[PDB]
């Protein structure tokens, strides 16, 4: 069983120098990793997986999971991103810091799309849960079990969508077709982060650094 109400509960329970945006990005990502763990524990059945598989899933998905969350958090921001530090990153600032291209993609492919369809917190939580239960993650002791949990999530989301937005038969599909963009944006953000590491912008010894070097 995978009640969509538990997933919303998990969401609600946790949620000008050129140098400011990168500093704030690193501080924000590290901060939200600690919160992400508490979120994942609130997702039905995640805590019942073997520890090693729970580790594999969070290491495979934390980046897209955090990007989904700040993108949805930014719906209210005018042409910008609201970081968990509280910094509003806007376009000129993003470009002066070297993250201009990804800024533009996040706004056009995630934030604006989340806003135009009025993606609600239950839909966001179910998408994140789908990301979390990623059966493609390498090294799972039992991908079939993780795939089964994924399947329960999107069955529940689909039925949620059909009973809350009866007039929008394509809504469930539309939600899922935002995952490919989340995948390539995650890859680009991760490339930035490995570059920030290379050049010494990332603070050391953090939980973020553990994700980058595990």
């Amino acid at each position: 069983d995978m009640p969509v109400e538990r997933i919303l509960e998990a969401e609600l329970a946790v949620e000008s120098s050129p140098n400011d945006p990168v500093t704030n990005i690193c501080q924000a990502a590290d901060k939200q990793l600690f919160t992400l763990v508490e979120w994942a524990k609130r997702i039905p059945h995640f805590s019942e997986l073997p520890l090693d598989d729970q580790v594999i899933l969070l290491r495979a998905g934390w980046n897209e999971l955090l990007i989904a969350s700040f993108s949805h958090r930014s719906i209210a921001v005018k042409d910008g991103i609201l970081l968990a530090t509280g910094l509003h990153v806007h376009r000129n600032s993003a470009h002066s810091a070297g993250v201009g291209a990804i800024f533009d993609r996040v706004l056009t492919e995630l934030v604006s799309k989340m806003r135009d369809m009025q993606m609600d917190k239950t839909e966001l939580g179910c998408l994140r849960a789908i990301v979390l239960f990623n059966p493609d993650s390498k090294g799972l002791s039992n991908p079939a079990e993780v795939e089964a949990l994924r399947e329960k999530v999107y069955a529940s989301l689909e039925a949620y969508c059909k009973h809350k937005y009866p007039e929008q038969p394509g809504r469930f599909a539309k939600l899922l077709l935002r995952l490919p963009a989340l995948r390539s944006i995650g890859l680009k953000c991760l490339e930035h982060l490995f570059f920030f590491k290379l050049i010494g912008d990332t603070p050391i010894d953090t939980f973020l650094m553990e994700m980058l070097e595990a």
Binding site: V37, S47, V55, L58, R59, F207, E210, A214
Partner: peptide, 10 residues
Amino acid sequence: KHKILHRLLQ
């Protein structure tokens, strides 16, 4: 070590 995640999952 790289067990920050492991200890938080407990």
